[PDB]
Amino acid sequence: GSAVSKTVCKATTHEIMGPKKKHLDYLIQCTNEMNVNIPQLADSLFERTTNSSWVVVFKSLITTHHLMVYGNERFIQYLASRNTLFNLSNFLDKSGLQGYDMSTFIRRYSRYLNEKAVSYRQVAFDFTKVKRGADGVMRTMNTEKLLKTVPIIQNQMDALLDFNVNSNELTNGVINAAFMLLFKDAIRLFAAYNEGIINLLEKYFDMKKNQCKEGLDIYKKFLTRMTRISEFLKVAEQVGIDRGDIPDLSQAPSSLLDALEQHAAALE
Amino acid sequence: MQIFVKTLTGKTITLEVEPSDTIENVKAKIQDKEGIPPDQQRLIFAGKQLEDGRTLSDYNIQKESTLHLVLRLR
């Protein structure tokens, strides 16, 4: 309890480095123990986003992101239930040149964690942690849920690509640590997105005339997002990331629009 | 000749054919290389589902053309 709040502060010192593994692994340990005051923990991290240093604020967001990905699901569930999550729409650290540069990136990253939280609330599971493959969640979803679900994947994606950082702006250990977590979410979210699309394209040719309209707009959007995902993956390539970890987007079903349009034409 | 078949999961198949081979025969050869029962194979080219009795030449499928395979429910 007193130890939690103190490890939160250790994760979020003014040291210009990402949160330390020892403090992040302890916090993960916390979330999983039986009598955790999850609200109190979350509360301590929000409190550190009220701070005026960009270093503190951005490391508190990174820790929260880290804990949504690796912490007990109970942590992401609480964040998604809250009324207000991160209120950093006006954040600005005028202290120096780094503060000025890193304040736009704090505003964007805070927006992305809020969307991640809303995404979880709207479908009640984490797109980046559900069973993959031909019997996974997104491949086997039934038609109604699929059509309501794939748009929520797309809105999370869009908020991730809005961080919109160039490789030559990843100039300190804080923003890089955020970047690497954004990268991890992106490839897992794209995997969930490509899988929903596969399913959609399979079902499309037995769908009703007005489900093909919903599905056709989902797909058109999938194609525009893929051009922007490839730009983000080029930043990843530039920074030096293992190229076997970058998805090959040429494998996505990206050339079927014509088939989907002629088939909607025939349905009229 | 050589044609390609791209599945929705991303694999690209290479198949040996002749322009006269029926779409039904082309599906049977996809059975032989990938295991997919022909009755679950939608083949698509130039935006149209390809009919079993028509031939590759009836659809303008020549060398190095890529067909799309979409799996279907019986």
Author numbering:
A (entry chain A): 19 to 286
B (entry chain B): 1 to 74
Wording from the paper:
Here, we show that additional components of the endocytic machinery including CALM, HIP1R, and Sla2 bind Ub via their N-terminal ANTH domain, a domain belonging to the superfamily of ENTH and VHS domains. ANTH domains are part of the larger family of ENTH (Epsin N-Terminal Homology) and VHS (Vps27, HRS, STAM) domains that are found in the N-terminus of proteins that play a variety of roles in endocytosis and many bind Ub (Moshkanbaryans et al., 2014; Takatori and Tomita, 2019). ANTH domains are structurally similar to ENTH domains but are larger, with an additional 3 C-terminal α-helices.
We obtained a crystal structure of the CALM ANTH domain in a complex with Ub that we verified with NMR and mutagenesis experiments. Structural studies revealed that Ub binds with µM affinity to a unique C-terminal region within the ANTH domain not found in ENTH domains. Mapping the chemical shift perturbations from HSQC experiments with 15N-Ub bound to the CALM ANTH domain onto the ANTH:Ub crystal structure showed that the residues undergoing the largest changes were located at the interface captured in the crystal structure. The CALM-ANTH:Ub interface showed hydrophobic interactions between Ub (L8, I44, V70) and CALM ANTH (F223, L274); and electrostatic interactions between Ub (R42, K48) and CALM (D224, D276) -To confirm this structure, we performed a series of Paramagnetic Relaxation Enhancement (PRE) experiments that are summarized in Figure 2D. The largest PRE effects from the HSQC of 15N-Ub resulting from binding to CALM spin-labeled at residues 209, 268, and 284 were mapped onto the CALM:Ub structure and confirmed that in solution, Ub bound the same region and orientation as observed in the crystal structure. We mutated residue F223, since it sits within the hydrophobic interface with Ub, and mutated residues D224 and D276, which make electrostatic interactions with R42 and K48 of Ub. Although wildtype CALM-ANTH caused significant chemical shift perturbations within the 15N HSQC spectra, no perturbations were observed when F223 was altered to Ser or Ala alone or in combination with altering D224R or D276A. These results were confirmed in GST-pulldown experiments using GST fused to five tandem copies of linear Ub that bound the wildtype CALM ANTH domain but not a mutant ANTH domain carrying the F223A single substitution or the combined F223S and D224R double substitutions. In this structure, the v-SNARE helix sits in the same region as the C-terminal helix of CALM (residues 261–276). This proposed binding mode for v-SNAREs substantially overlaps with that for Ub.
